[PDB]
Amino acid sequence: VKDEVGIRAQKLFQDFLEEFKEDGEIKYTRPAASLESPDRCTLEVSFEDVEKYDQNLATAIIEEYYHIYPFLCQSVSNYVKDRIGLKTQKDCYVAFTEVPTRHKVRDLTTSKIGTLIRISGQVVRTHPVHPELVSGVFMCLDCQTEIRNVEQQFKFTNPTICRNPVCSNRKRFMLDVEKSLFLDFQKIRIQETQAELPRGCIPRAVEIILRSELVETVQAGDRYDFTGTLIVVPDVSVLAGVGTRAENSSRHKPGMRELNYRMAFLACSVQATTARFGGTDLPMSEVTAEDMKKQMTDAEWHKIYEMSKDRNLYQNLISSLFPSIYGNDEVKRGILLQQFGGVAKTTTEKTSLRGDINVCIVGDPSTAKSQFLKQVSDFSPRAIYTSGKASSAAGLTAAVVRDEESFDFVIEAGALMLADNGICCIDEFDKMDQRDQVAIHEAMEQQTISIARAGVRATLNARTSILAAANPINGRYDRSKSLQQNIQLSAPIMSRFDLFFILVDECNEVVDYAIARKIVDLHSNIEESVERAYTREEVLRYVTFARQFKPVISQEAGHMLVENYGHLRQRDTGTSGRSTWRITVRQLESMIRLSEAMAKLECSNRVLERHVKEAFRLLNKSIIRVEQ
Amino acid sequence: EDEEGKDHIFPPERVELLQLLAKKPDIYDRLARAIAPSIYENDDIKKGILLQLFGGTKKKHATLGRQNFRSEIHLLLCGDPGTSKSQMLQYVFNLVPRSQYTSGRGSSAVGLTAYVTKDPETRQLVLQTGALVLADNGVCCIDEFDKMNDSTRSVLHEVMEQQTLSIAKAGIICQLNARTSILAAANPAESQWNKRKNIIDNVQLPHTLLSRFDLIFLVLDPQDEIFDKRLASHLVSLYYVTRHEEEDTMFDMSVLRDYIAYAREHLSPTLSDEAQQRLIQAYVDMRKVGAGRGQISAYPRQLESLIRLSEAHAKVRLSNQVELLDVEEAWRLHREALKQSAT
DNA sequence: CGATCGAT
DNA sequence: ATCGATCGTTTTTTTTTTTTT
Numbered sequence A: 001v002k003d004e005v006g007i008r009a010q011k012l013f014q015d016f017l018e019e020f021k022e023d024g025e026i027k028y029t030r031p032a033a034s035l036e037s038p039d040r041c042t043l044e045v046s047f048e049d050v051e052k053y054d055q056n057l058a059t060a061i062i063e064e065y066y067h068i069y070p071f072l073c074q075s076v077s078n079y080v081k082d083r084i085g086l087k088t089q090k091d092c093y094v095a096f097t098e099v100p101t102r103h104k105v106r107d108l109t110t111s112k113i114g115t116l117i118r119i120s121g122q123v124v125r126t127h128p129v130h131p132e133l134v135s136g137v138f139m140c141l142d143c144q145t146e147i148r149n150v151e152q153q154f155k156f157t158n159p160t161i162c163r164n165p166v167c168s169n170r171k172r173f174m175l176d177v178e179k180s181l182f183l184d185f186q187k188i189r190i191q192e193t194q195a196e197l198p199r200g201c202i203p204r205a206v207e208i209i210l211r212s213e214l215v216e217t218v219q220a221g222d223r224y225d226f227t228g229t230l231i232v233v234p235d236v237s238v239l240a241g242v243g244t245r246a247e248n249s250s251r252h253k254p255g256m257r258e259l260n261y262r263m264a265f266l267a268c269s270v271q272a273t274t275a276r277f278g279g280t281d282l283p284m285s286e287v288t289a290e291d292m293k294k295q296m297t298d299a300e301w302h303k304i305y306e307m308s309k310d311r312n313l314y315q316n317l318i319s320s321l322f323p324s325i326y327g328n329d330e331v332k333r334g335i336l337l338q339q340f341g342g343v344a345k346t347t348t349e350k351t352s353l354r355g356d357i358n359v360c361i362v363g364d365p366s367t368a369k370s371q372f373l374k375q376v377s378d379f380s381p382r383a384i385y386t387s388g389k390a391s392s393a394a395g396l397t398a399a400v401v402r403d404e405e406s407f408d409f410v411i412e413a414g415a416l417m418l419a420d421n422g423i424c425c426i427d428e429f430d431k432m433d434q435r436d437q438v439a440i441h442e443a444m445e446q447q448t449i450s451i452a453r454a455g456v457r458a459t460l461n462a463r464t465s466i467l468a469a470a471n472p473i474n475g476r477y478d479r480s481k482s483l484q485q486n487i488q489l490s491a492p493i494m495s496r497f498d499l500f501f502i503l504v505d506e507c508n509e510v511v512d513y514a515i516a517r518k519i520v521d522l523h524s525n526i527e528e529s530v531e532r533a534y535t536r537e538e539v540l541r542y543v544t545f546a547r548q549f550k551p552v553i554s555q556e557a558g559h560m561l562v563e564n565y566g567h568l569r570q571r572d573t574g575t576s577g578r579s580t581w582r583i584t585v586r587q588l589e590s591m592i593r594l595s596e597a598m599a600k601l602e603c604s605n606r607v608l609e610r611h612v613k614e615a616f617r618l619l620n621k622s623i624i625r626v627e628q
Numbered sequence B: 001e002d003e004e005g006k007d008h009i010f011p012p013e014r015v016e017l018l019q020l021l022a023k024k025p026d027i028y029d030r031l032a033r034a035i036a037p038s039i040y041e042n043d044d045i046k047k048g049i050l051l052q053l054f055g056g057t058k059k060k061h062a063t064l065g066r067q068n069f070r071s072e073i074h075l076l077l078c079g080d081p082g083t084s085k086s087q088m089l090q091y092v093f094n095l096v097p098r099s100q101y102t103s104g105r106g107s108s109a110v111g112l113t114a115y116v117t118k119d120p121e122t123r124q125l126v127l128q129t130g131a132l133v134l135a136d137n138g139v140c141c142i143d144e145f146d147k148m149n150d151s152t153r154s155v156l157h158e159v160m161e162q163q164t165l166s167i168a169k170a171g172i173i174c175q176l177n178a179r180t181s182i183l184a185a186a187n188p189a190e191s192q193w194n195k196r197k198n199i200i201d202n203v204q205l206p207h208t209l210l211s212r213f214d215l216i217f218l219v220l221d222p223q224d225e226i227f228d229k230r231l232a233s234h235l236v237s238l239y240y241v242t243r244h245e246e247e248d249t250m251f252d253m254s255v256l257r258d259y260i261a262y263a264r265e266h267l268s269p270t271l272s273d274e275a276q277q278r279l280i281q282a283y284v285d286m287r288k289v290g291a292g293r294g295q296i297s298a299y300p301r302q303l304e305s306l307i308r309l310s311e312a313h314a315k316v317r318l319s320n321q322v323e324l325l326d327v328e329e330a331w332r333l334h335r336e337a338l339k340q341s342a343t
Numbered sequence C: 001c002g003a004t005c006g007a008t
Numbered sequence D: 001a002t003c004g005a006t007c008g009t010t011t012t013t014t015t016t017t018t019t020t021t
């Protein structure tokens, strides 16, 4: 038999890593040790390590793989047997990696089979889980049916001759779906590499298949690294293949099937890169291996305590993410509270209670209100941005279909709608048509929305806050008309938005030259930016930690937010004579979570009356800022 | 030719001639003069073309991860039908490496992206192809700009101002990369640009979005009856002979073409002190512009374009460090076509 | 063109 | 067991009307 060399090879590979494999340690025993209890049968193996210990079985491997492949499972079983009292339930999935060579859709021939190569592309027109009972039990009819044999080939054949008797050799027993061998896969398609975009021909597409553990972790918009298991495809029928046809015409002494095979492709490894984030128990670049609530959730307390303790870190952090930017210092402190948590109570079945807050920008032209947010897509997770007219109202809705593809009417998603716990802000809120506008009129507040005309019990939900992009009528803040005529917009959204912070433009020479003095350290290609206080890694980790705390109110300003709000509406008892304005409890709700988040800054629970006072100050800022 | 990079490397003997070309202060006009095959009228813009011939500088942003300001170069030509914008640039389609040629009403927004339909190869339909993401860094010669629905031309705001794309359909949902520079040949809703009605409104666009562009070097019919005969005779004789001459306009077979090609790659303009500080002084009156009724004025995006122009013109002359003269031709480029609406 | 079925 | 005579065997289409946003 051919591959007994491969048998002994991975055998003594085990026998070496049965001892140490890496510095008195092994990287593929503790994965197997976690395996031992549930026995899930997936273990990736480093391809480098074949060249480390086995001394270039890569070329012993990377051609006759498809035939050798099954012997690796027997090898796997032999591994698990040595130290575990073992039954042959064991199996072999593999998710190979540590492989160098990266080829594409063009170097395809008869000579490319049985390899392990890594390849990318795109993901399109996905398709579902569709099981397989590959195996069973089948022989003659009478008694002699105990058949756990090798009958699991792709080309399936109930017909078997016999095991013990002289009995039927076409009349089969019945089937076993009970105590036999089954498994799963799916099927999707892939387009040409967007890293390899030549002219002329189409995006030649490949067929693709996935084993058990690979499943439902592919997804549209993602590039990959496969195995190189190009196939002889056990196909059944096709046209246009009018080549010569053959079949075994046996010995003369004193069934048919037309043969035209097609191609597909199979793979048993994935690194869905460019699509990987990780929360806080992932060890980052900067860590501190310590004990904590969880693994690395705040094990950098050794610093994050410090980043939660200073009375200076407020302003320092206000200045630790605008190094390349200069403007007012109010949104530079308020906008983070949009990204910073809210309330997060633990309370009744009254109704959904919200954590997030509406947020706005207005300003004169060319003020880099865009550059505030152009980065934010690159900044936060879940929170990817484009414009609203960057798509249709198949941004909010999906693309409305009136032709038959699966059931002839499909509006079940959107573009705003898939921003769950991230914001997908938009620009140009003034000239956009009043369709998504009145959709947002309740989709921001009552985050539980429906449609008709194509509804599969339409109940969708927004999840996050927003960033606005207004601009005045004349392009300038010419004080010649009221704000209600300066923007020519509605009331309730001007109250739904509990925070405005308009950016006004002027002309004073020192300012503009000071900006160019920013530019002094924008192209000094060494030192083209300004100093900082806090690195990004610790910043986002502190952010990722500061939520898990259960913020609380028991504070006399919590008792006497009645007092500050009574004064809020005492001074706002007017705002009715000269160009009347409106007060409303959304303002209170917003101040509440605002004060709460302002104390969530503290890495502490339990609201303090300082936070109320600053929140009152800021609300006063916003409302007097609304003053004409 | 195309952009593999490896299968295009040039020999040192050609580098001799390339740096020879660079050794001309005449080079500032030579290649702009070598733009046309035979056209010898008022090429004063072809220098402004040539900053996109030598197609822009690469101010990378692998440095801070922030603010991703490419040296975005964006210029369009607009004027009357007399100018051969369509034909010039039909020939320039036979120049540009990533030569495209579409225009108003050749293809929709989805006629530029998501060519989605059935595929009997898979026996299934697939999510499929586009136009612009094939033309990264390239150009599409374009005409009849004031012809499209608002569906298109609100895409261009997205790319011209962010140079991006993020897409959401029921099938694949994508955040791709797309980015390139313009050429276009926009037209008005009129037949001639109306005298005493600037393109501030003549071509069909809004109030300061018209102002938003870097600078569109204006085009119009030459208002002089006389010069027709010269080229009506010379460039018809061009046909009558059906060949050229390598006169003072020495048309290089490929000695022009690698100074084009090789000068995309090994070059890195840098600023020490030269080409910045002039308007960093003169911004006093450059932003006394706050006054005006319904006008459009000076803004602090201009200098971004100025630095970009500057590193572009340092690309010609191959000055690894800053060129200063680029400022002077930049100011020229400006105020030859910024006083078209003093009104 | 395939399997059933009978006898030699 | 072997051969031969018995039994039974069938597949091909593309486009027009009213409806909904």
Ligand SMILES: Nc1ncnc2c1ncn2[C@@H]1O[C@H](COP(=O)(O)OP(=O)(O)O)[C@@H](O)[C@H]1O
Pocket (backbone or CB within 6 Å): A324, A325, A326, A327, A364, A365, A366, A367, A368, A369, A370, A371, A515, B300, B301
């Ligand atoms: N404080 C600042 N920091 C950085 N860039 C700035 C600042 N102020 C202005 N700018 C520049 O001014 C430009 C503003 O343009 P932008 O406001 O995006 O146009 P629009 O007004 O159409 O939104 C940006 O390109 C930005 O680089």
Ligand SMILES: Nc1ncnc2c1ncn2[C@@H]1O[C@H](COP(=O)(O)OP(=O)(O)O)[C@@H](O)[C@H]1O
Pocket (backbone or CB within 6 Å): B039, B040, B041, B080, B081, B082, B083, B084, B085, B086, B087, B143, B185
């Ligand atoms: N310098 C030139 N060389 C060659 N042809 C010219 C020149 N100047 C004008 N033309 C002629 O003028 C016409 C310009 O029309 P065209 O530019 O195609 O209209 P539009 O301006 O709508 O694109 C062309 O047919 C071209 O032959």
